Amino acid sequence: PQDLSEALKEATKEVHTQAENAEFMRNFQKGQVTRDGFKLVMASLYHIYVALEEEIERNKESPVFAPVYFPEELHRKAALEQDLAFWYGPRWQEVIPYTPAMQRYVKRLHEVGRTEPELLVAHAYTRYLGALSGGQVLKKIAQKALDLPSSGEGLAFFTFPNIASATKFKQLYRSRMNSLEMTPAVRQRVIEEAKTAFLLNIQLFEELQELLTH
Ligand code: HEM
């Protein structure tokens, strides 16, 4: 399509469904998520967002990313740190897993941020817009399956405190993406990078499912 935002949505519709169809995610949607499974997901998110946000900070002034730089509204690292301390305890940093599939994703994020910054928007799009769109759905399913105590911690990741209206912000974020100027060749690679992001997620889901079925 014309607008990059619409192009991305349309181009990733298929892989998004593939993600929804992933065995690990099928069970999650069926409400069959376990505490051990959720912990692995949260650990994965921590590594992914740490890498993504390190690269965003590196390229925040670049014309290829500046337009979609919203640190206060979107940063998730601090929220995940809070959540992991709850899920894995005070020594979470020493015990959280960092698996090969998580590493593959992190490696690509750093590769992009350091050598193909123009493609970082694809990763920011897939992570942030995804979390902002289906985050509520996924969160509701989680808490109603995890039967968490009432300790007031563990799911901060699912709440963006600095965004008053998700609908308003999503429109703003899409507008900024559409403001980005890139050659057709680059735009093609951004679209492809977005699909790659989903694929990295899917391979991660396959790995986590394998680790949990022993
Ligand atoms: C358990 C599986 C998942 C569910 C149930 C889910 C659910 C949703 C929902 C309800 C939407 C809103 C669609 C709309 O705006 O009308 C959405 C959008 C989106 N999701 Fe997911 N999602 C899942 C997994 C993922 C994954 C793995 C990623 C990231 C790799 C992701 C990335 C996105 C993106 C980028 C959008 C934004 C679409 C747009 O451009 O408007 N989702 N998701």
Side-chain angles (χ1 to χ4, degrees):
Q2 179 170 62
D3 293 324
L4 176 61
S5 63
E6 295 178 300
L8 286 168
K9 185 178 181 63
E10 187 179 61
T12 58
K13 182 179 180 299
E14 188 167 301
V15 287
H16 186 284
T17 297
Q18 196 179 318
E20 294 176 66
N21 293 341
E23 176 173 35
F24 186 68
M25 284 296 97
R26 291 206 298 275
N27 291 317
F28 190 107
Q29 300 176 72
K30 283 180 173 54
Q32 295 176 293
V33 65
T34 67
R35 184 157 300 177
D36 293 326
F38 194 72
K39 280 172 58 180
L40 277 176
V41 173
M42 294 302 279
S44 299
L45 296 176
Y46 168 76
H47 292 118
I48 292 165
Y49 281 95
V50 163
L52 174 65
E53 300 181 347
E54 179 192 315
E55 292 310 327
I56 286 182
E57 283 301 297
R58 187 198 312 294
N59 303 99
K60 61 180 179 176
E61 303 285 57
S62 180
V64 304
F65 195 86
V68 294
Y69 181 60
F70 291 98
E72 294 303 308
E73 295 70 30
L74 298 171
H75 81 283
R76 296 290 77 201
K77 176 173 168 287
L80 284 158
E81 287 168 348
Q82 295 286 339
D83 291 343
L84 282 179
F86 168 77
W87 291 106
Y88 284 90
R91 300 183 69 175
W92 64 276
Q93 281 274 33
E94 297 169 64
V95 305
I96 55 164
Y98 185 35
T99 69
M102 288 174 200
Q103 296 163 199
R104 189 174 317 98
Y105 204 152
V106 167
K107 179 184 178 183
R108 180 55 185 165
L109 283 168
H110 286 305
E111 267 171 31
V112 168
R114 301 193 173 187
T115 65
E116 304 187 69
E118 65 268 21
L119 308 189
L120 197 57
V121 61
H123 283 286
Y125 160 71
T126 54
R127 297 317 315 188
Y128 299 124
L129 238 61
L132 210 55
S133 301
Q136 315 72 60
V137 175
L138 300 169
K139 168 184 164 58
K140 292 181 177 180
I141 301 178
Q143 59 179 302
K144 303 298 180 178
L146 279 45
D147 179 56
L148 299 181
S150 298
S151 53
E153 310 178 66
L155 302 175
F157 172 74
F158 297 92
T159 292
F160 291 82
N162 300 145
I163 291 177
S165 176
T167 57
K168 300 293 172 58
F169 187 81
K170 287 181 63 182
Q171 294 169 52
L172 168 60
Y173 197 88
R174 288 174 177 163
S175 176
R176 293 302 190 82
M177 284 188 279
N178 297 323
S179 77
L180 292 173
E181 286 174 49
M182 51 183 87
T183 66
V186 175
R187 172 152 168 158
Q188 297 188 305
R189 281 206 286 294
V190 169
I191 298 303
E192 291 305 307
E193 193 60 29
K195 294 193 306 177
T196 296
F198 280 85
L199 296 179
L200 285 167
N201 273 275
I202 293 165
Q203 36 191 54
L204 169 61
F205 291 152
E206 295 178 355
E207 184 200 60
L208 303 184
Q209 176 71 197
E210 193 289 314
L211 291 172
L212 293 160
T213 50
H214 289 292

PDB file of all heavy atoms in Angstrom, residues 174-203:
ATOM      1  N   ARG A 174       1.834   5.594  14.036  1.00  0.00           N
ATOM      2  CA  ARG A 174       1.688   5.228  12.633  1.00  0.00           C
ATOM      3  C   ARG A 174       2.007   6.437  11.764  1.00  0.00           C
ATOM      4  O   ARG A 174       2.643   6.314  10.721  1.00  0.00           O
ATOM      5  CB  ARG A 174       0.266   4.738  12.357  1.00  0.00           C
ATOM      6  CG  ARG A 174      -0.015   3.370  12.950  1.00  0.00           C
ATOM      7  CD  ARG A 174      -1.467   2.958  12.785  1.00  0.00           C
ATOM      8  NE  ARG A 174      -1.684   1.607  13.291  1.00  0.00           N
ATOM      9  CZ  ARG A 174      -2.876   1.096  13.579  1.00  0.00           C
ATOM     10  NH1 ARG A 174      -3.971   1.827  13.413  1.00  0.00           N
ATOM     11  NH2 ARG A 174      -2.972  -0.144  14.038  1.00  0.00           N
ATOM     12  N   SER A 175       1.566   7.609  12.205  1.00  0.00           N
ATOM     13  CA  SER A 175       1.819   8.838  11.466  1.00  0.00           C
ATOM     14  C   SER A 175       3.322   9.084  11.349  1.00  0.00           C
ATOM     15  O   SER A 175       3.820   9.465  10.287  1.00  0.00           O
ATOM     16  CB  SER A 175       1.156  10.023  12.168  1.00  0.00           C
ATOM     17  OG  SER A 175       1.460  11.240  11.508  1.00  0.00           O
ATOM     18  N   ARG A 176       4.042   8.864  12.444  1.00  0.00           N
ATOM     19  CA  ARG A 176       5.485   9.066  12.450  1.00  0.00           C
ATOM     20  C   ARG A 176       6.175   8.082  11.516  1.00  0.00           C
ATOM     21  O   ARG A 176       7.095   8.452  10.788  1.00  0.00           O
ATOM     22  CB  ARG A 176       6.046   8.917  13.867  1.00  0.00           C
ATOM     23  CG  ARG A 176       5.616  10.005  14.839  1.00  0.00           C
ATOM     24  CD  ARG A 176       6.003  11.400  14.354  1.00  0.00           C
ATOM     25  NE  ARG A 176       5.788  12.409  15.390  1.00  0.00           N
ATOM     26  CZ  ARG A 176       6.638  12.655  16.382  1.00  0.00           C
ATOM     27  NH1 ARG A 176       7.771  11.974  16.477  1.00  0.00           N
ATOM     28  NH2 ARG A 176       6.351  13.576  17.290  1.00  0.00           N
ATOM     29  N   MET A 177       5.737   6.826  11.538  1.00  0.00           N
ATOM     30  CA  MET A 177       6.327   5.824  10.662  1.00  0.00           C
ATOM     31  C   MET A 177       6.129   6.256   9.217  1.00  0.00           C
ATOM     32  O   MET A 177       7.038   6.147   8.397  1.00  0.00           O
ATOM     33  CB  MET A 177       5.672   4.454  10.866  1.00  0.00           C
ATOM     34  CG  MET A 177       6.111   3.718  12.117  1.00  0.00           C
ATOM     35  SD  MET A 177       5.457   2.033  12.135  1.00  0.00           S
ATOM     36  CE  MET A 177       3.839   2.329  12.696  1.00  0.00           C
ATOM     37  N   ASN A 178       4.935   6.755   8.916  1.00  0.00           N
ATOM     38  CA  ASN A 178       4.617   7.194   7.564  1.00  0.00           C
ATOM     39  C   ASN A 178       5.374   8.455   7.167  1.00  0.00           C
ATOM     40  O   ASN A 178       5.406   8.812   5.990  1.00  0.00           O
ATOM     41  CB  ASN A 178       3.114   7.432   7.417  1.00  0.00           C
ATOM     42  CG  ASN A 178       2.302   6.169   7.631  1.00  0.00           C
ATOM     43  OD1 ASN A 178       2.720   5.079   7.242  1.00  0.00           O
ATOM     44  ND2 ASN A 178       1.131   6.311   8.240  1.00  0.00           N
ATOM     45  N   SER A 179       5.984   9.125   8.142  1.00  0.00           N
ATOM     46  CA  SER A 179       6.737  10.346   7.860  1.00  0.00           C
ATOM     47  C   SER A 179       8.162  10.009   7.440  1.00  0.00           C
ATOM     48  O   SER A 179       8.843  10.824   6.818  1.00  0.00           O
ATOM     49  CB  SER A 179       6.775  11.258   9.093  1.00  0.00           C
ATOM     50  OG  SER A 179       7.711  10.792  10.054  1.00  0.00           O
ATOM     51  N   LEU A 180       8.608   8.806   7.788  1.00  0.00           N
ATOM     52  CA  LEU A 180       9.954   8.362   7.449  1.00  0.00           C
ATOM     53  C   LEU A 180      10.170   8.325   5.942  1.00  0.00           C
ATOM     54  O   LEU A 180       9.326   7.830   5.197  1.00  0.00           O
ATOM     55  CB  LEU A 180      10.217   6.969   8.022  1.00  0.00           C
ATOM     56  CG  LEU A 180      10.323   6.814   9.539  1.00  0.00           C
ATOM     57  CD1 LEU A 180      10.413   5.334   9.888  1.00  0.00           C
ATOM     58  CD2 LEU A 180      11.541   7.557  10.049  1.00  0.00           C
ATOM     59  N   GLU A 181      11.308   8.849   5.502  1.00  0.00           N
ATOM     60  CA  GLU A 181      11.644   8.864   4.085  1.00  0.00           C
ATOM     61  C   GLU A 181      12.704   7.814   3.786  1.00  0.00           C
ATOM     62  O   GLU A 181      13.787   7.821   4.372  1.00  0.00           O
ATOM     63  CB  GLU A 181      12.135  10.255   3.675  1.00  0.00           C
ATOM     64  CG  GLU A 181      11.015  11.281   3.577  1.00  0.00           C
ATOM     65  CD  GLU A 181      11.521  12.684   3.303  1.00  0.00           C
ATOM     66  OE1 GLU A 181      12.338  12.854   2.373  1.00  0.00           O
ATOM     67  OE2 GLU A 181      11.093  13.618   4.016  1.00  0.00           O
ATOM     68  N   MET A 182      12.380   6.904   2.873  1.00  0.00           N
ATOM     69  CA  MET A 182      13.294   5.832   2.507  1.00  0.00           C
ATOM     70  C   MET A 182      13.112   5.417   1.050  1.00  0.00           C
ATOM     71  O   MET A 182      12.029   5.562   0.484  1.00  0.00           O
ATOM     72  CB  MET A 182      13.060   4.623   3.421  1.00  0.00           C
ATOM     73  CG  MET A 182      11.599   4.196   3.507  1.00  0.00           C
ATOM     74  SD  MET A 182      11.298   2.812   4.646  1.00  0.00           S
ATOM     75  CE  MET A 182      11.080   3.680   6.200  1.00  0.00           C
ATOM     76  N   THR A 183      14.181   4.904   0.451  1.00  0.00           N
ATOM     77  CA  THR A 183      14.137   4.455  -0.934  1.00  0.00           C
ATOM     78  C   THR A 183      13.273   3.203  -1.010  1.00  0.00           C
ATOM     79  O   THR A 183      13.171   2.453  -0.040  1.00  0.00           O
ATOM     80  CB  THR A 183      15.538   4.097  -1.456  1.00  0.00           C
ATOM     81  OG1 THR A 183      16.032   2.955  -0.744  1.00  0.00           O
ATOM     82  CG2 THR A 183      16.494   5.261  -1.257  1.00  0.00           C
ATOM     83  N   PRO A 184      12.628   2.965  -2.163  1.00  0.00           N
ATOM     84  CA  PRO A 184      11.783   1.777  -2.307  1.00  0.00           C
ATOM     85  C   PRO A 184      12.515   0.502  -1.885  1.00  0.00           C
ATOM     86  O   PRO A 184      11.915  -0.407  -1.316  1.00  0.00           O
ATOM     87  CB  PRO A 184      11.433   1.793  -3.791  1.00  0.00           C
ATOM     88  CG  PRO A 184      11.322   3.261  -4.070  1.00  0.00           C
ATOM     89  CD  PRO A 184      12.548   3.815  -3.365  1.00  0.00           C
ATOM     90  N   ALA A 185      13.814   0.448  -2.162  1.00  0.00           N
ATOM     91  CA  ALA A 185      14.628  -0.709  -1.810  1.00  0.00           C
ATOM     92  C   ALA A 185      14.662  -0.893  -0.297  1.00  0.00           C
ATOM     93  O   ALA A 185      14.499  -2.006   0.207  1.00  0.00           O
ATOM     94  CB  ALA A 185      16.042  -0.539  -2.345  1.00  0.00           C
ATOM     95  N   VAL A 186      14.884   0.204   0.420  1.00  0.00           N
ATOM     96  CA  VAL A 186      14.927   0.168   1.877  1.00  0.00           C
ATOM     97  C   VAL A 186      13.558  -0.235   2.411  1.00  0.00           C
ATOM     98  O   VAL A 186      13.448  -1.141   3.240  1.00  0.00           O
ATOM     99  CB  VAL A 186      15.313   1.548   2.459  1.00  0.00           C
ATOM    100  CG1 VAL A 186      15.232   1.519   3.982  1.00  0.00           C
ATOM    101  CG2 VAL A 186      16.719   1.918   2.014  1.00  0.00           C
ATOM    102  N   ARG A 187      12.516   0.436   1.931  1.00  0.00           N
ATOM    103  CA  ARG A 187      11.162   0.127   2.366  1.00  0.00           C
ATOM    104  C   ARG A 187      10.884  -1.363   2.207  1.00  0.00           C
ATOM    105  O   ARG A 187      10.257  -1.978   3.071  1.00  0.00           O
ATOM    106  CB  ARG A 187      10.140   0.949   1.571  1.00  0.00           C
ATOM    107  CG  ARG A 187       8.694   0.553   1.823  1.00  0.00           C
ATOM    108  CD  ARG A 187       7.749   1.724   1.614  1.00  0.00           C
ATOM    109  NE  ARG A 187       6.350   1.306   1.586  1.00  0.00           N
ATOM    110  CZ  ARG A 187       5.323   2.115   1.827  1.00  0.00           C
ATOM    111  NH1 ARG A 187       5.534   3.392   2.125  1.00  0.00           N
ATOM    112  NH2 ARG A 187       4.083   1.653   1.756  1.00  0.00           N
ATOM    113  N   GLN A 188      11.355  -1.946   1.106  1.00  0.00           N
ATOM    114  CA  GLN A 188      11.152  -3.372   0.876  1.00  0.00           C
ATOM    115  C   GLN A 188      11.826  -4.168   1.987  1.00  0.00           C
ATOM    116  O   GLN A 188      11.261  -5.132   2.503  1.00  0.00           O
ATOM    117  CB  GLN A 188      11.738  -3.807  -0.472  1.00  0.00           C
ATOM    118  CG  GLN A 188      11.099  -3.165  -1.690  1.00  0.00           C
ATOM    119  CD  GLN A 188      11.590  -3.778  -2.990  1.00  0.00           C
ATOM    120  OE1 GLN A 188      12.793  -3.838  -3.249  1.00  0.00           O
ATOM    121  NE2 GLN A 188      10.657  -4.234  -3.816  1.00  0.00           N
ATOM    122  N   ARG A 189      13.039  -3.764   2.353  1.00  0.00           N
ATOM    123  CA  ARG A 189      13.765  -4.463   3.404  1.00  0.00           C
ATOM    124  C   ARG A 189      13.150  -4.260   4.783  1.00  0.00           C
ATOM    125  O   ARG A 189      13.252  -5.137   5.640  1.00  0.00           O
ATOM    126  CB  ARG A 189      15.243  -4.052   3.409  1.00  0.00           C
ATOM    127  CG  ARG A 189      16.055  -4.765   2.329  1.00  0.00           C
ATOM    128  CD  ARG A 189      17.525  -4.884   2.701  1.00  0.00           C
ATOM    129  NE  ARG A 189      18.237  -3.619   2.581  1.00  0.00           N
ATOM    130  CZ  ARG A 189      18.453  -2.996   1.428  1.00  0.00           C
ATOM    131  NH1 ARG A 189      18.009  -3.528   0.299  1.00  0.00           N
ATOM    132  NH2 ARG A 189      19.115  -1.849   1.403  1.00  0.00           N
ATOM    133  N   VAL A 190      12.511  -3.113   5.003  1.00  0.00           N
ATOM    134  CA  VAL A 190      11.867  -2.859   6.291  1.00  0.00           C
ATOM    135  C   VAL A 190      10.697  -3.829   6.426  1.00  0.00           C
ATOM    136  O   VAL A 190      10.496  -4.444   7.475  1.00  0.00           O
ATOM    137  CB  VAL A 190      11.332  -1.410   6.391  1.00  0.00           C
ATOM    138  CG1 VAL A 190      10.434  -1.259   7.613  1.00  0.00           C
ATOM    139  CG2 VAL A 190      12.498  -0.440   6.479  1.00  0.00           C
ATOM    140  N   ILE A 191       9.929  -3.962   5.349  1.00  0.00           N
ATOM    141  CA  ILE A 191       8.786  -4.859   5.333  1.00  0.00           C
ATOM    142  C   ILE A 191       9.256  -6.276   5.620  1.00  0.00           C
ATOM    143  O   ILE A 191       8.677  -6.975   6.452  1.00  0.00           O
ATOM    144  CB  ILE A 191       8.084  -4.843   3.961  1.00  0.00           C
ATOM    145  CG1 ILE A 191       7.541  -3.443   3.671  1.00  0.00           C
ATOM    146  CG2 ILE A 191       6.975  -5.887   3.927  1.00  0.00           C
ATOM    147  CD1 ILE A 191       6.597  -2.908   4.709  1.00  0.00           C
ATOM    148  N   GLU A 192      10.307  -6.696   4.921  1.00  0.00           N
ATOM    149  CA  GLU A 192      10.863  -8.030   5.098  1.00  0.00           C
ATOM    150  C   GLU A 192      11.412  -8.231   6.509  1.00  0.00           C
ATOM    151  O   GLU A 192      11.280  -9.313   7.079  1.00  0.00           O
ATOM    152  CB  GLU A 192      11.972  -8.286   4.076  1.00  0.00           C
ATOM    153  CG  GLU A 192      11.472  -8.418   2.649  1.00  0.00           C
ATOM    154  CD  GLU A 192      10.396  -9.476   2.513  1.00  0.00           C
ATOM    155  OE1 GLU A 192      10.633 -10.619   2.954  1.00  0.00           O
ATOM    156  OE2 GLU A 192       9.316  -9.167   1.966  1.00  0.00           O
ATOM    157  N   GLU A 193      12.030  -7.192   7.066  1.00  0.00           N
ATOM    158  CA  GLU A 193      12.586  -7.285   8.414  1.00  0.00           C
ATOM    159  C   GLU A 193      11.465  -7.518   9.425  1.00  0.00           C
ATOM    160  O   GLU A 193      11.652  -8.217  10.422  1.00  0.00           O
ATOM    161  CB  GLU A 193      13.344  -6.005   8.774  1.00  0.00           C
ATOM    162  CG  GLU A 193      14.213  -6.120  10.025  1.00  0.00           C
ATOM    163  CD  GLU A 193      15.286  -7.188   9.897  1.00  0.00           C
ATOM    164  OE1 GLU A 193      15.731  -7.450   8.757  1.00  0.00           O
ATOM    165  OE2 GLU A 193      15.699  -7.761  10.930  1.00  0.00           O
ATOM    166  N   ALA A 194      10.302  -6.927   9.172  1.00  0.00           N
ATOM    167  CA  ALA A 194       9.167  -7.100  10.071  1.00  0.00           C
ATOM    168  C   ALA A 194       8.737  -8.567  10.059  1.00  0.00           C
ATOM    169  O   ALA A 194       8.416  -9.138  11.105  1.00  0.00           O
ATOM    170  CB  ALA A 194       8.009  -6.204   9.646  1.00  0.00           C
ATOM    171  N   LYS A 195       8.728  -9.178   8.878  1.00  0.00           N
ATOM    172  CA  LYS A 195       8.353 -10.584   8.780  1.00  0.00           C
ATOM    173  C   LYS A 195       9.408 -11.427   9.488  1.00  0.00           C
ATOM    174  O   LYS A 195       9.089 -12.424  10.140  1.00  0.00           O
ATOM    175  CB  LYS A 195       8.231 -11.020   7.318  1.00  0.00           C
ATOM    176  CG  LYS A 195       7.083 -10.353   6.566  1.00  0.00           C
ATOM    177  CD  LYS A 195       6.816 -11.046   5.232  1.00  0.00           C
ATOM    178  CE  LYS A 195       8.071 -11.130   4.379  1.00  0.00           C
ATOM    179  NZ  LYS A 195       7.827 -11.876   3.112  1.00  0.00           N
ATOM    180  N   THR A 196      10.667 -11.016   9.365  1.00  0.00           N
ATOM    181  CA  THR A 196      11.763 -11.726  10.009  1.00  0.00           C
ATOM    182  C   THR A 196      11.578 -11.688  11.522  1.00  0.00           C
ATOM    183  O   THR A 196      11.867 -12.661  12.212  1.00  0.00           O
ATOM    184  CB  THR A 196      13.124 -11.098   9.650  1.00  0.00           C
ATOM    185  OG1 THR A 196      13.351 -11.240   8.242  1.00  0.00           O
ATOM    186  CG2 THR A 196      14.253 -11.782  10.409  1.00  0.00           C
ATOM    187  N   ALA A 197      11.103 -10.555  12.035  1.00  0.00           N
ATOM    188  CA  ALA A 197      10.879 -10.423  13.471  1.00  0.00           C
ATOM    189  C   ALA A 197       9.875 -11.486  13.921  1.00  0.00           C
ATOM    190  O   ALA A 197      10.094 -12.182  14.914  1.00  0.00           O
ATOM    191  CB  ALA A 197      10.359  -9.024  13.797  1.00  0.00           C
ATOM    192  N   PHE A 198       8.772 -11.617  13.191  1.00  0.00           N
ATOM    193  CA  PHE A 198       7.776 -12.621  13.544  1.00  0.00           C
ATOM    194  C   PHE A 198       8.390 -14.015  13.503  1.00  0.00           C
ATOM    195  O   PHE A 198       8.172 -14.824  14.404  1.00  0.00           O
ATOM    196  CB  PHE A 198       6.577 -12.573  12.592  1.00  0.00           C
ATOM    197  CG  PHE A 198       5.591 -11.495  12.915  1.00  0.00           C
ATOM    198  CD1 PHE A 198       5.769 -10.201  12.443  1.00  0.00           C
ATOM    199  CD2 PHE A 198       4.470 -11.776  13.687  1.00  0.00           C
ATOM    200  CE1 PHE A 198       4.841  -9.206  12.731  1.00  0.00           C
ATOM    201  CE2 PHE A 198       3.540 -10.788  13.980  1.00  0.00           C
ATOM    202  CZ  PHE A 198       3.725  -9.502  13.500  1.00  0.00           C
ATOM    203  N   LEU A 199       9.169 -14.293  12.464  1.00  0.00           N
ATOM    204  CA  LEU A 199       9.794 -15.602  12.339  1.00  0.00           C
ATOM    205  C   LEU A 199      10.725 -15.911  13.506  1.00  0.00           C
ATOM    206  O   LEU A 199      10.790 -17.051  13.967  1.00  0.00           O
ATOM    207  CB  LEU A 199      10.554 -15.701  11.017  1.00  0.00           C
ATOM    208  CG  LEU A 199       9.652 -15.618   9.783  1.00  0.00           C
ATOM    209  CD1 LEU A 199      10.508 -15.691   8.533  1.00  0.00           C
ATOM    210  CD2 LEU A 199       8.636 -16.755   9.800  1.00  0.00           C
ATOM    211  N   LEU A 200      11.451 -14.902  13.979  1.00  0.00           N
ATOM    212  CA  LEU A 200      12.354 -15.095  15.112  1.00  0.00           C
ATOM    213  C   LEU A 200      11.524 -15.410  16.356  1.00  0.00           C
ATOM    214  O   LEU A 200      11.939 -16.198  17.207  1.00  0.00           O
ATOM    215  CB  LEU A 200      13.193 -13.839  15.342  1.00  0.00           C
ATOM    216  CG  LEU A 200      14.336 -13.601  14.349  1.00  0.00           C
ATOM    217  CD1 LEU A 200      14.860 -12.188  14.518  1.00  0.00           C
ATOM    218  CD2 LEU A 200      15.451 -14.620  14.575  1.00  0.00           C
ATOM    219  N   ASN A 201      10.358 -14.782  16.454  1.00  0.00           N
ATOM    220  CA  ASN A 201       9.455 -15.009  17.584  1.00  0.00           C
ATOM    221  C   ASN A 201       8.925 -16.435  17.522  1.00  0.00           C
ATOM    222  O   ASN A 201       8.879 -17.143  18.530  1.00  0.00           O
ATOM    223  CB  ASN A 201       8.265 -14.048  17.526  1.00  0.00           C
ATOM    224  CG  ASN A 201       8.541 -12.726  18.205  1.00  0.00           C
ATOM    225  OD1 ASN A 201       8.374 -12.589  19.417  1.00  0.00           O
ATOM    226  ND2 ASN A 201       8.967 -11.739  17.422  1.00  0.00           N
ATOM    227  N   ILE A 202       8.517 -16.846  16.328  1.00  0.00           N
ATOM    228  CA  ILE A 202       7.974 -18.183  16.131  1.00  0.00           C
ATOM    229  C   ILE A 202       9.005 -19.259  16.455  1.00  0.00           C
ATOM    230  O   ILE A 202       8.678 -20.246  17.112  1.00  0.00           O
ATOM    231  CB  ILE A 202       7.444 -18.349  14.692  1.00  0.00           C
ATOM    232  CG1 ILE A 202       6.222 -17.444  14.509  1.00  0.00           C
ATOM    233  CG2 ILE A 202       7.074 -19.808  14.423  1.00  0.00           C
ATOM    234  CD1 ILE A 202       5.809 -17.234  13.066  1.00  0.00           C
ATOM    235  N   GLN A 203      10.250 -19.077  16.025  1.00  0.00           N
ATOM    236  CA  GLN A 203      11.258 -20.075  16.347  1.00  0.00           C
ATOM    237  C   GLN A 203      11.475 -20.098  17.859  1.00  0.00           C
ATOM    238  O   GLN A 203      11.729 -21.151  18.434  1.00  0.00           O
ATOM    239  CB  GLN A 203      12.576 -19.800  15.613  1.00  0.00           C
ATOM    240  CG  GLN A 203      12.936 -18.351  15.443  1.00  0.00           C
ATOM    241  CD  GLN A 203      14.093 -18.173  14.486  1.00  0.00           C
ATOM    242  OE1 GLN A 203      14.051 -18.646  13.351  1.00  0.00           O
ATOM    243  NE2 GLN A 203      15.132 -17.492  14.937  1.00  0.00           N
TER     244      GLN A 203
END
